[PDB]
Design a protein around this ligand. Sequence first.
Ligand SMILES: NC(=[NH2+])NCCC[C@H](N)C(=O)O
Ligand SMILES: NC(=[NH2+])NCCC[C@H](N)C(=O)O
Lengths: 305, 296
Amino acid sequence: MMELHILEHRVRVLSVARPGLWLYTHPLIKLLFLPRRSRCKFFSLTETPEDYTLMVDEEGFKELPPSEFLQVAEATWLVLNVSSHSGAAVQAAGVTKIARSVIAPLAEHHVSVLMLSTYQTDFILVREQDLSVVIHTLAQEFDIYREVGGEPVPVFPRTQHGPSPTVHPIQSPQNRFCVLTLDPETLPAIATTLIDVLFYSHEPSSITFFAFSLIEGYISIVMDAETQKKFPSDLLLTSSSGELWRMVRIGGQPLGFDECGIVAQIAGPLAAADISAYYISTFNFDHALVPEDGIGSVIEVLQRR
Amino acid sequence: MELHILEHRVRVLSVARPGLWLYTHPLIKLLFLPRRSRCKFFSLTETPEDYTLMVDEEGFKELPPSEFLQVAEATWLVLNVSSHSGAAVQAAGVTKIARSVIAPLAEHHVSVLMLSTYQTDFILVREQDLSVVIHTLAQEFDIYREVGGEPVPGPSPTVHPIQSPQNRFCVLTLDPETLPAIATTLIDVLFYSHPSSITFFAFSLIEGYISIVMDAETQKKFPSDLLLTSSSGELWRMVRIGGQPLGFDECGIVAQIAGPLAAADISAYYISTFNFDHALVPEDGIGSVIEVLQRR
Ligand SMILES: NC(=[NH2+])NCCC[C@H](N)C(=O)O
Ligand SMILES: NC(=[NH2+])NCCC[C@H](N)C(=O)O
């Protein structure tokens, strides 16, 4: 009934250490602001305290020179997206809704995922080495398509052994986050501010977290409510005003890319509690965004897991 | 009749094009984020050969050394002529000080660099020469040194070829509060865009005043009704001066360009870059200009 789409993106996952970010100002600004200057169709940049995580298609990857500040995940990642029958886009912040149908099945079959929720939709990245299993695992409950050119197309055999799944500690900083979009034609108007925030910036427990993605021409931004005050008024867009979000940071040790079942151990319980959630993986840690009014509940759900 | 020594200590550098990317982070700051640096004198000129930078010491601190960055040896001071009570003189007035400033400094072996902007004409001199400068200019000018914002009271000369590309140039200013609105475009032009025409683009932010020199074709790329220009109609043609890099020691080059133009009563902006000199003259007069300058 429901459809699962394999998008036409081959994605690399990278981490830029803060002290070296300046070195990559020239390519990044290009990828951020000059769509006529590159062939990139998948760009995601997330600032955390640890680093800047990049998820970029191969075309954008060509723009980033190697250095001691740039760590590159070894695998190439494919991008999955759930939609409804006939191809209608499903509501955003729906990571918990696919907890039983996508996340848990993939975890059970030892498929490691990376999550990238955006304003528009929820992307699930899987290593190309696992594609067959993915299909095998999800063909029962989804009609699977491959996006060839611009239109859909109906659809090594050893899943590697990962480390033993464990329970990971969680933290909840006090920041109030917003999920916003933007008319691309207005991106220049915020450019300088965005640049200032990404490249030249930097007790209540708070975290530095700022996500900007440009994917198939769609812009998505996750930012602190205070950071939004820095931006020109009446440009940042959201269809549900007053909706602010609290973050649950998942991980004590860096999580790597081999352990499975982390997203599942967060989204399962939240799904059972009927709580909506965005979910964004960075190079080292996971991040869930839940409605602020429910944060307490969420914590209690996650501490008895 | 006043000569002001401004409170700027300036370094003159050249970034080779293949290395420009390395300096995107500092330059953007200096271009667009005034709250993030103490720099008060910033000039960036793109030429076919390089990007010439003139930056005060604070801005100089932001620029890491590399194989693409040439640095002129001396520290330069900034001179500016003004009227009876500090009132500013007309812009494009390099020729109007040909007799009173440029020629005397050349005669006393003081090497200069010129930086004309939309607002005024700056004359840079190596600090080691300051005394001579005073000794030369005290007779005709009341000399004031700017302190805390208040005015407190070589090689053998050589012939240089001249060339006039066909670009029509505009000298423009901008309200700083509108600088964000053009940022991306400006960035695209400076950092991501790279014959009887030349590649020449000047941007300066000096004491909060913005000045831009660009060809009309480049002006079409910018959002309309933001770039400001007082007198319009007749744009400017460039005369490029030099057949090989001119260095910083030879004197009398500016004098041999601005002197004759002064005698012909022709106005001119004048911009020195790391390697060559550039005069901007009214376009409809280019023929006359070339005739005046080749009387030699
Ligand atoms: N670097 C990371 N964020 N790793 C954790 C991502 C989620 C984990 N691979 C899972 O399948 O549940
Ligand atoms: N790099 C240069 N632009 N050099 C020439 C500057 C003018 C010359 N020093 C003069 O005093 O007349």
